[PDB]
Write a protein that binds this ligand. Structure first.
Ligand SMILES: *C(=O)N1C[C@H](NOS(=O)(=O)O)CC[C@H]1C(N)=O
Length: 227
C-alpha cells in the first residue's frame, strides 16, 4: 500500500537528491529535542516496501520479550545479520502475539502472509516514514517492552561510538532475479545534545543495504548531526 496518514508536524522538506545521485529513494529523520521530522522525497517515503533484515529489530524485541533470547548470541547475530537466528525466533512466536504487537506498534500493513519469513520480500510492507515513526515510538514511548530489552537491542545495533556521537542501525537488502531490489538502513544517533531517529530507503539504481548506509552517513554528516 501507501502510508497515507497525515503527519501533524511542521516537518522540514529536504533536498538530498545530489547525495542520492543515480539512486532513487527517500530519507526521514526525527529530532527528539526539537520534536521535528525532516523528509527528503515525501512521496517515496510513504510507499510501502518489504523491510527485509531491518525487521530483525522487532524480531529481537519479540525474542527478548518472550525470553526466547535469554541470559552465537544477539550481538553477533544482529551485526552479521545471521538469518537462521531470526527465522527461528519468528517460528517460536505465536501468530496472535505477533499480530497483536504489529497492531500496537502500527507496523506498516501488518500483513503476516504465510507466517514464514513474511518480512523478506513477501507480505509485510512498511514505508520509510513509518520506519522512523514506529522505531522512535517503540523505543521512546512503548512501555510494554522493558528497558532491559531495549538496552540489549541497542547494544546489538551499535555501529560507531566516539566522543562526538553513537551510531546505531540495521541494514536490509532485498534481492529479486539475482540483483539488488530494495535497500534499507534504519537507526538512530545519540549526540551530546540530541537524539535522532532516521531511515534511508533505496527503490532503484543500486538499492543495496550498504548503499543505504553510506548515503545515510553522508546526509547525517552534511546536516551536522555528526559534528
Ligand atoms: C536482510 O535484509 N538480509 C539478511 C542479510 N543481511 O542483510 S544486510 O547485509 O543488508 O544487513 C543478508 C541480506 C538480506 C537477505 N535478503 O538475505
Amino acid at each position: 500500500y501507501n502510508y497515507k496518514k497525515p503527519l501533524h508536524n511542521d516537518y522540514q522538506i529536504l533536498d538530498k537528491s545530489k547525495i542520492f545521485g543515480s539512486n532513487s529513494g527517500s530519507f526521514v529523520m526525527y529530532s527528539m529535542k526539537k520534536d521535528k521530522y525532516y523528509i527528503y522525497n515525501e512521496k517515496e517515503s510513504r510507499k510501502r516496501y518489504s523491510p527485509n533484515s531491518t525487521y530483525k529489530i522487532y524480531l529481537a524485541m519479540f525474542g527478548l520479550d518472550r525470553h526466547i533470547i535469554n541470559d552465537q548470541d544477539l550481538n553477533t547475530a544482529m551485526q552479521n545479520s545471521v538469518n537462521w537466528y531470526f527465522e527461528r525466533i519468528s517460528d517460536q512466536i505465536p501468530k496472535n502475539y505477533t499480530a497483536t504487537q504489529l497492531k500496537q506498534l502500527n507496523y506498516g500493513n501488518k500483513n503476516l502472509g504465510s507466517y514464514k519469513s513474511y518480512w523478506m520480500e513477501d507480505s509485510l510492507k512498511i514505508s520509510n516514514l513509518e520506519q522512523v515513526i514506529v522505531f522512535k515510538n517503540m523505543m521512546e514511548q512503548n512501555n510494554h517492552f522493558s528497558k532491559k530489552a531495549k538496552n540489549q537491542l541497542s547494544s546489538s545495533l551499535l555501529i560507531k561510538k566516539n566522543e562526538k556521537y553513537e551510531l546505531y542501525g540495521k541494514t536490509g537488502t532485498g534481492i529479486v532475479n539475482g540483483k539488488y531490489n530494495n535497500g534499507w538502513f534504519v537507526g538512530y544517533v545519540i549526540t551530546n545534545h540530541d537524539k535522532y531517529y532516521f531511515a534511508t530507503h533505496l527503490s532503484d539504481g543500486k538499492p543495496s543495504g550498504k548503499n543505504a548506509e553510506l548515503i545515510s552517513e553522508k546526509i547525517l554528516k552534511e546536516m551536522g548531526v555528526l559534528n
